[PDB]
Amino acid sequence: KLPPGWEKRMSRSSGRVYYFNHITNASQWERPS
């Protein structure tokens, strides 16, 4: 379970997974917590 606001996404450029927070609009490569 991700913390509130976070989504797991996929990069259309590299095929890598990343994480996006739609509350803060932050994105990062590493899984949050």
Structure solved via = X-ray
Query: 2-32 burial by CB neighbour count: b if 16+ within 10 A, else e?
Result: eeeebeeeeeeeeeeeebebeeeeeeeeeee
Indicate the resolution in Å: 2.2
CATH number of 1-33: 2.20.70.10
**Residue extents of the structural domains in the chain:** 1-33
- Triad 15, 4, 2: Cα angle to 5°: 50
Instruction: Say if CB 22 and CB 5 are below 8 A apart.
Output: yes
